[PDB]
Design a protein around this ligand. Structure first.
Ligand SMILES: CN(C)C(=N)NCCC[C@H](N)C(=O)O
Length: 64
């Protein structure tokens, strides 16, 4: 138990994640979820970078 999910995420979903390097949000796809830690491994689309970031950092892709 680490991050208590406030959002329900599934593998292969598009989300926006906060890049650990800039702290800004970027579009990323969930590759793997760890519900215990409340984290998901996401891959930033276009760049190809991937990081394990808590579901709390994952935001829905709101196009506006
Ligand atoms: C959200 N992510 C991963 C990024 N915004 N990445 C930018 C740095 C990596 C890029 N290939 C580059 O070297 O420019």
């Amino acid at each position: 138990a680490s991050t208590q999910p406030t959002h329900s995420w599934k593998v292969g979903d598009k989300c926006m994640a906060v890049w650990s390097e800039d702290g800004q949000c970027y579009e990323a796809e969930i590759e793997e979820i760890d519900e215990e830690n409340g984290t998901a491994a996401i891959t930033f689309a276009g760049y190809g970078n991937a990081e394990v970031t808590p579901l709390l950092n994952l935001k829905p892709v709101e196009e506006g």
